[PDB]
Design a protein around this ligand. Structure first.
Ligand SMILES: Cc1cc2nc3c(=O)[nH]c(=O)nc-3n(C[C@H](O)[C@H](O)[C@H](O)COP(=O)(O)OP(=O)(O)OC[C@H]3O[C@@H](n4cnc5c(N)ncnc54)[C@H](O)[C@@H]3O)c2cc1C
Ligand SMILES: Cc1cc2nc3c(=O)[nH]c(=O)nc-3n(C[C@H](O)[C@H](O)[C@H](O)COP(=O)(O)OP(=O)(O)OC[C@H]3O[C@@H](n4cnc5c(N)ncnc54)[C@H](O)[C@@H]3O)c2cc1C
Ligand SMILES: Cc1cc2nc3c(=O)[nH]c(=O)nc-3n(C[C@H](O)[C@H](O)[C@H](O)COP(=O)(O)OP(=O)(O)OC[C@H]3O[C@@H](n4cnc5c(N)ncnc54)[C@H](O)[C@@H]3O)c2cc1C
Ligand SMILES: Cc1cc2nc3c(=O)[nH]c(=O)nc-3n(C[C@H](O)[C@H](O)[C@H](O)COP(=O)(O)OP(=O)(O)OC[C@H]3O[C@@H](n4cnc5c(N)ncnc54)[C@H](O)[C@@H]3O)c2cc1C
Lengths: 398, 398, 398, 398
């Protein structure tokens, strides 16, 4: 009826603001937020030391209806609009807890399985995934090839109705907890272009020859279980194949737009969270007989940060609106992923600076936020690549 | 029904794009775009030498219905909506012709008169204005005080029911071709703050005392007749007072947001032009066998500008929509003005650079768009002031 | 004895600072400064309206001992060291007067002739240039390419002992007042790579077929006469050929390091100028009960500008001490050229901002400085080419 | 002889380059680089798990002459000029091992003692600190005040010739290992400003009431034992007081230039390391049938980076030379600490990107460099306070 946009809101993270949301979305958001305050934030520090979140926190997120929110109810998901899905990405961001990998799981893997899987595959996976009993992961990057997809060597050869898979992936989110992993492999070692020789497989924990590697020591996402996967002559039945044979690259191209929107929103949300935290810190930090928020350099530094966050938010919210109507193209999503991910980092740099030396301490949220932010301009295709795609329609007009 | 957003358009300027416009608005845009291509661009380079546009080009746009577009029809205006008006700003910016002080005429002066004037004042001014016969300008800035209000000394003292006006003003747009000018003067040197002692006055070309000063020699807007004004003992009738006495600042407060949104739209629009003008140019510029557009670096710089231009566009239309609903608070207005004008300049700079040496010759459109862009971060309040304002809500909880 | 660096200096433009200079140089500098305040500044106002400067001031300069300074005395030059010629580039930059093409004339045109020329060409023109009678220039860029390295199409085919020249040039400094103009042509188009099919010819005002296009209308450098040059069939004796035939490129190469170190020192010197001009303005511009120089944001903006101008100056000074020792490679010089020139612009953008409206008036020195800085990033080889050149040793191992 | 400057050396880290060094300096540099490769690098990953290095590495360092390098030989140190002390800083920075607090020990603590101590204090400490058997630390910062000195609560009430020290410190380098701590306390509460009521005190491990707090958990400098200290009614003998009573501020001010120059060189050396580390990585990273270094963009990002590193190195070397001559003032020193440190982070960010996703893995050096670099723009005084000091000489006449 009379909803406010972020610039005008009391706090960038307030509830019931931004035009793309309805009052039902508001009610949902308040509960998702309660959920993070109570079931996630409290245990996060321990998962960090642990290297991954608990299955128990997944099992609950599912019983609560936070997993597979944009997945069709008649397909096994909870069945909400896109806006309801983003509320989950955003609220997780706002809790500044990066351990839970619900997004990779809910917004990516599940979409691949429902948008391109057999009636059987969907029936078998989707339900467990929504309940959080079956955690999802997707592995496409390899030691050698990450930006040059046309050069990844993981392969799958037919041996009757079966597919024998060999290879290894790296940097796989949820890699440790993963029960089902959508593996990207070369099936046609002789297609004209490697973009017509890739297939997708639903590999599972339990298959002989599926070896999960050591959990990666990173500078951020301390609670995210990023790991390596190895495949040693894994015999996959016919049903392991996700979608049509050799159509692998095609299914991907169609899902990337959403994988990037997801990142873009997460990053700008992260930015909003950092901004209210820091604004807070400097308004309570005594200095020179008053607070640091009284300093003009600080006042303008905060003005520049808020402006860039609201301006960008506007564009991401604009993108969410489009993807809901299924009119979000590759280039567009790319612009959101890239800018939002670069800003997230520039915001963090300045927000750690305003905390002074406490911003370097792990006990303060902003420290986590800073190293957590550096991954965003990298995965989902680096920003360099984002520009390649964006420039396509610019210089090589159809 | 269904429209594309700037990112996916074939050109950031095509008509029919942007979700905030109707099929009708496009017809009007097609026509205004037309007006500028024939009635303006051809003669602009000539007006540049003259230091001002012709009163003829003004009148044409008058009858053409390009003035007072957002001014209510029953008040002497063409009675359109905010968007229709925005179109006008945008098309002129797209023409790369900064001479016509059209925007300040329709968007600021006329709005001041209708929103705050009285019956005679409205029936005596608007028509001549909507007609393009009685040009307008607004003067506030002074030699010693722009960003400061306790710094202006232009004043008016009562003598019965008349007002004797004295002082000067500088940097006035349409200063030379103006017929009516809204002067800001002090009328109560006793008010605690100058915000309680300022009034608005409608001075008309021809009044004894009113003097048109030197046409300032600027670095850009070589066709805008930016001048200086003098008021030597002018006896103004009680009819000149616009609004209550000592309420002037309160009105200026209400109108600034529209001044800032305009400049913002004009700013980003100006960027949208430079992009295509530069995209196209480097696509056709032969070098090393192919064109310069085949250089990856040129491809990325190009992606960078488009992303920034598109992300800001989204925000500016966000602000047009809010203002159409008369729900655009000052802070948001300021963010628009500040970030858009700023972007405009780092875009104008890169675009020149991609135009190599020729981006330095006045023959090419970009060159002038560069020196024209530099004035945006300064008027309507310097970007520094914008930040002061946007920081108010961040730090001072009222 | 003791000497401070720019940071410690009272003003950045103080005489008697920077390790590389001696009292010897200091006396000559005060000597040169005087020349610019008394013989250049006074008339610049006018030359900007004539597009070109007076032929007289050039004779005054030369007679005075400014033209031909790094030019050895045994060949008709003042013979001073590099620091001496540097002092001339700098002082002019400090004068904010860009009309005089003194630097291209005695820093480039005179080196070429005396570095690869016959004892005839030397005796014949050097002395007349040093005197300020024969104004020199050089042309290599054409409307088709400035960076192609072969985009040059102006050819020079032999006909006995006298060469027949043919082609055209663009963006030529000292274009109109040019008595002599070195030209780069294709003497052996059959060459493996055109870096071997180029030669140099000393075109002289008067030769039949040597036409001079009119004054180019530029955005900045107003009193700098830049025009196009044509060659419609001129018979040139066996003397016009400078150095060897087809071994011409080797020359352009061996002198480029110096053209670029020149622009560098200029850029940073103009930057040292703008800083002090702007610091002066702020310290006296009243605002909010005290000077704008009392605002913390300004104080900080000023510190960023000083630090960069100081960090860089040091580098340019380092590049000077190296060049004085004939050991400044292409790469090092390019760096100084790339960074100095860019910095000059950012410094210019911020300096204008601190002047407010007034920074956009041709009245104020900073205004012309702004547009006169936009050319450095472009000429002497664009900053992009500077990057190509620096990248080589980085990536492609020698 | 013919020493080269960084822009022309094979590797910015090659020994034998940069003009401020001598053949004996290079001989020393090989010795130290070697020590870091043998005694430090190999054990660092374990010290990282521990949160502090071993005392063994210290006693080693001491024995091999790396501690107290620029301290007077007759005073207990090992004698030697600044350039030699700079090399120990730089080399450590080149080993990318921030664990050992050798610099804060030799570059700061020892200097405070040998510059203002007593013949008794000097004799009792330097010897043991040179042997690395007595590790020192500096403690000024307190939880509620790090920039505002007017707010440090640690105090010492005089009692006879005794001092009763109470209070606490936080963010203290070598805090855990610390054998001697230079604590800054308020000795005169009713003083005119707080800059006249501060004394320095030599607090030693073993003093009753000197409790070492816990090691702080940071985002970087994982092997640096940063802790918080407490002073509980410690009765310091009169020999505990360093220098004149209440003149503590004066000693600090005198030393600050060296502390900021040190942080600065450490920064630019880390950048030199990172650049070379990344250049190397892209040359060996195969992508698209070629390397990452074949892409034009990577080439320019590399040229840009190298240019800023070579330029900031030029300015930093100049500071060392100035400091060797004892003519390095506050401002110049802040200038280097502020810019070098910000650049270090900019450089670290782009080097992580160029490493793709591997730059986020702790296994890779560039990852340590990233978090390890974020601390420099903060300690030694924040970069904002740096600007404050630089901005002093600009706006307020001496
Ligand atoms: C913690 C973490 C989580 C991640 N999660 C997943 C996941 O779950 N599943 C998965 O498969 N991957 C994931 N990744 C990997 C990530 O998607 C890849 O790192 C990224 O897509 C490509 O980087 P790369 O590692 O392949 O490095 P490369 O691709 O070898 O190098 C990339 C860099 O090289 C340069 N570059 C590359 N191509 C170009 C170009 N064409 N033009 C200009 N420059 C170019 C730029 O520096 C670019 O950033 C994750 C990574 C991390 C670190
Ligand atoms: C081409 C052109 C057309 C214009 N048209 C009009 C017009 O038609 N009518 C009209 O009246 N005016 C107009 N102006 C004037 C313009 O609005 C003023 O320049 C502007 O409002 C204030 O700038 P100033 O020149 O007064 O600078 P000042 O106010 O003297 O100084 C401004 C600068 O000081 C510093 N500054 C000032 N205050 C702060 C602060 N609070 N915090 C941090 N920094 C601060 C910043 O450097 C800021 O940029 C125009 C100006 C130009 C150049
Ligand atoms: C006022 C003025 C004075 C000048 N004086 C002289 C003079 O005295 N004599 C003379 O001969 N010239 C002079 N010039 C011309 C100047 O040297 C050229 O403009 C400059 O070398 C750029 O070449 P260009 O103008 O042909 O632009 P182009 O080379 O056509 O375009 C340059 C742009 O294209 C892209 N680009 C080009 N090459 C590359 C690349 N290799 N890699 C990545 N990007 C690239 C970048 O955007 C680059 O900025 C002057 C120019 C001006 C305006
Ligand atoms: C790991 C590490 C090691 C360190 N080692 C030492 C050590 O050995 N000994 C020691 O005592 N300290 C050390 N420190 C502490 C460091 O020196 C201080 O944190 C720093 O000097 C001030 O930080 P603060 O948090 O107290 O600043 P705060 O006052 O909490 O906040 C500072 C920030 O507020 C703003 N601000 C503050 N003042 C102004 C101003 N006046 N004008 C404009 N903006 C301002 C800026 O954001 C400034 O950066 C170290 C810190 C860390 C993290």
């Amino acid at each position: 009826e009379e909803r406010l946009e972020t610039p005008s809101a009391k706090k960038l993270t307030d509830i019931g603001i931004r035009r793309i949301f309805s009052p039902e979305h508001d009610i949902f958001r308040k509960s998702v937020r309660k959920f993070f305050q109570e079931e996630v934030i409290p245990h996060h520090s321990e998962w960090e030391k642990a290297g991954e979140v608990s299955r128990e926190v997944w099992e609950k997120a599912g019983k609560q209806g936070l997993l597979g929110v944009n997945i069709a109810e008649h397909l096994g998901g909870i069945g909400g609009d896109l806006y309801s899905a983003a509320i989950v990405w955003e609220e997780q961001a706002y809790s500044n807890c990066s351990g839970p990998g619900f997004s990779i799981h809910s917004g990516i893997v599940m979409s691949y399985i429902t948008n391109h899987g057999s009636e059987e595959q969907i029936k078998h996976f989707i339900p467990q995934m929504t309940a959080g009993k079956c955690i999802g992961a997707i592995a496409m990057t390899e030691p050698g090839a990450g930006s040059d997809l046309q050069g990844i060597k993981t392969n799958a050869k037919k041996d009757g109705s079966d597919w024998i898979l060999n290879g290894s992936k790296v940097f796989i989110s949820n890699g440790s907890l993963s029960d089902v992993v959508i593996v990207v492999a070369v099936t046609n070692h002789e297609a004209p272009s490697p973009a017509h020789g890739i297939s997708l497989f639903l590999v599972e924990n339990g298959m002989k020859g599926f070896i999960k590697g050591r959990k990666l020591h990173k500078m951020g996402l301390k609670a995210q279980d990023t790991a390596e996967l190895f495949f040693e002559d894994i015999r996959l039945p016919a049903s392991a194949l996700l979608g049509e044979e050799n159509k692998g690259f095609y299914y991907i191209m169609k899902e990337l737009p959403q994988e990037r929107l997801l990142i873009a929103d997460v990053a700008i949300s992260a930015s909003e969270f950092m901004f209210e935290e820091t604004r807070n810190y400097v308004k309570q930090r005594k200095a020179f007989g008053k607070t640091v928020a009284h300093l003009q350099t600080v006042q303008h530094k905060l003005a520049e940060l808020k402006t860039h966050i609201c301006v960008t938010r506007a564009f991401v919210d604009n993108c969410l609106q489009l993807h809901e109507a299924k009119r979000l193209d590759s280039a567009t999503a790319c612009m959101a992923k890239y800018w939002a991910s670069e800003l997230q980092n520039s915001v963090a740099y300045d927000c750690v600076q305003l905390h002074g030396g406490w911003g370097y301490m792990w006990e303060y949220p902003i420290a986590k936020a800073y190293v957590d932010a550096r991954v965003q301009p990298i995965y989902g295709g680096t920003n360099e690549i984002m520009k390649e795609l964006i420039a396509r329609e610019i210089v090589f007009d159809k």
